[PDB]
């Protein structure tokens, strides 16, 4: 066979396996070959399942129809997003926090922004992540050349600061033990643990970033699930404007997982070591490497940020929070240590003295329920399994019945 | 003022100015501050202007409504795109060319794929581009660290092979003069020259890539504007499957510039030097750095690839081709050397003894028409101006009247 003379990107070669969620899909498929009649319930990937509220879909359909009219047609949008949408995001989520319309960048989702931010930061920054954490932070870092090779002894890529979050530290890093890095990716409520940082903890985080001269990338994709009285935006912490940016999404709020609409906020006071504003480089990236979020998706997001849209999202979120409570109650009654669930639409179940991949496999094999093994979120996730609360009510209830039957004999 | 201790990405520092099209928009905005009541006609950025056909928008509206129902709701899609859409693209544009549904990757547009491909290739590849060419190829290369600094003497970033395309050579490079690189970005029809490579020229290009062990990134964003009997896909050239991939979009075909939907095709026989299939690394990038094109946009694209959708696109394309002829005739009658327009919805006009930014500024100040300075497309673009044919018919006619009035006595 013919081969080119182009060398494979050595950063791609560093990756240990495929992306976590496609790997789970492969195991789900293999399971269906083994059990063709199985009624599989997926509580693995956090994919929303309930319909989008009509007030929001109606706005998207209206935009689509408008595109067939002379007056209503629009072509390229400014890559930063429609001004009324930037304004609505700035006021709804950041009113009172000194965030301007021009600080908001509308995306086709948080996953995509994480990687565009990584292109922006480039190959020479070092990063810290919560351990465990959403795997895209680590994987994007490896792809960009910010890491060394994977070390199989410790299950870590070289040169990443993995900040261990455990039951014993309340799922917040012991910052006095964390080495200095350029970037700190910090998710609150955390995926997969569900832990929401308190005001005191976020204050510590901002102080740590300030002393170390680091940039915090704060992922607030589940913040509207907050039940405890904790900050929902990093910008609630005075000084955050000098060290932090925030990335978020409509995926988990309106069921926009397939529609694609998020945003990133970069404040004016966030500067590189030479005084250059970080937002100006992000603006160059989003103008050069992106051509804007879908106009229909932007119209849907604008409709979300109205009294009727907010009411609708609140109902969607409330439904998933009720699913979460059903799952928490099930595992608690089974005698498990169950974490998260309070501030996030998933639960983090402790399966000590087992491999999380083994637990994943056992649950799938015996109950036909897909979960996510904790080790998929980094070595700090070993010993845990994440169970998503996204599902139709009957599917949640059925999965819990199956869990109760599987684990009935494990505890008194 | 507080500053972090994070060093700015040195690749961002390399960029000589802002991205071309936002800079044009800034100048347009400045013009409207100067003259608030100016009736500005925008022929700079290639932004489509005519409505999307109803058959296509109806499909998008239907998908939106379906998302509010239990049965019709869908969440995350496959990051590669819906299988029926991949199948429709594969058969419609590549039927008979040995392209499978799994070779197609649905994107939110060609600009985005160019940059995701560049993340995939990484910092250690060298690139070649046509000179002039669409500026994203060069700027994405700089951002990814594949280049040196901008050299102001020659108006080139270091370590990029700029392939000279001129009226004299029919805007196809003399490949005997082109140095070996890892990647060759090649646009046909080319933006901004409008030049469509002939079958013979593409055969040369494929042979050149094969000898050099290079990967061609073929951008076919304007291929449906082809009037001459030239290949529309690189895969029409036997052997392309070993050396080429193709990126395209619905932007210029259905007016999806704001809707966002394109694709890339990476064939099975395209391998790195270690035998690793390039498509497998692209798949990892689109699974890790992307979450799929919008489900509504995918539904729109699926409706495009039907008899009614193709008919509707053909009509829109035809309208813009008519606009292009109006523009060609205007500049030709004024005595300018005008290139392109035959196979693409823009014209490439030669303005001797003048910088293209000065011509841009003069045209905007005097006629309130926005154009694109040729130098924005690389050093080979100096002395030229691109005029887009995307516009309402009355605006094209008005712009041409303004050009004639300005230039007829000179
Ligand atoms: C902390 C966090 N940040 C970003 C994302 C991606 O959100 P979008 O790209 O806007 O849908 C997600 C979504 N995570 C899901 C979906 C998986 C994925 O996006 O790869 C999960 O962990 O199952 C997330 O949890
Ligand atoms: C050769 C070529 N390749 C890709 C694109 C971008 O297409 P999409 O991102 O799918 O809308 C374009 C679009 N160019 C326009 C819009 C400018 C831009 O995309 O930045 C222009 O040249 O005016 C292009 O010309």
From Swiss-Prot, chain B:
Binding site for pyridoxal 5'-phosphate: 76, 110-111, 134, 191, 222, 249-251, 260, 291
Biological or metabolic pathway of the protein: Amino-acid biosynthesis; L-lysine biosynthesis via DAP pathway; LL-2,6-diaminopimelate from (S)-tetrahydrodipicolinate (aminotransferase route): step 1/1
SUPFAM superfamilies the record matches: PLP-dependent transferases
CDD domains in UniProt: AAT_like (cd00609)
GO molecular function, one term: copper ion binding
EC number: 2.6.1.83
Subcellular location as annotated: Plastid, Chloroplast
pH-activity dependence text: Optimum pH is 7.9 in Tris buffer and 7.6 in HEPES buffer.
Cofactor(s), by name: pyridoxal 5'-phosphate
Factors inducing expression: Not induced by pathogen infection, but down-regulated by dark treatment.
Positions of post-translational N6-(pyridoxal phosphate)lysine modification: 252
Protein's job: Required for lysine biosynthesis. Catalyzes the direct conversion of tetrahydrodipicolinate to LL-diaminopimelate, a reaction that requires three enzymes in E.coli. Not active with meso-diaminopimelate, lysine or ornithine as substrates.
Family: Belongs to the class-I pyridoxal-phosphate-dependent aminotransferase family. LL-diaminopimelate aminotransferase subfamily.
Protein name, UniProt field: LL-diaminopimelate aminotransferase, chloroplastic
Protein encoded by which gene: DAP
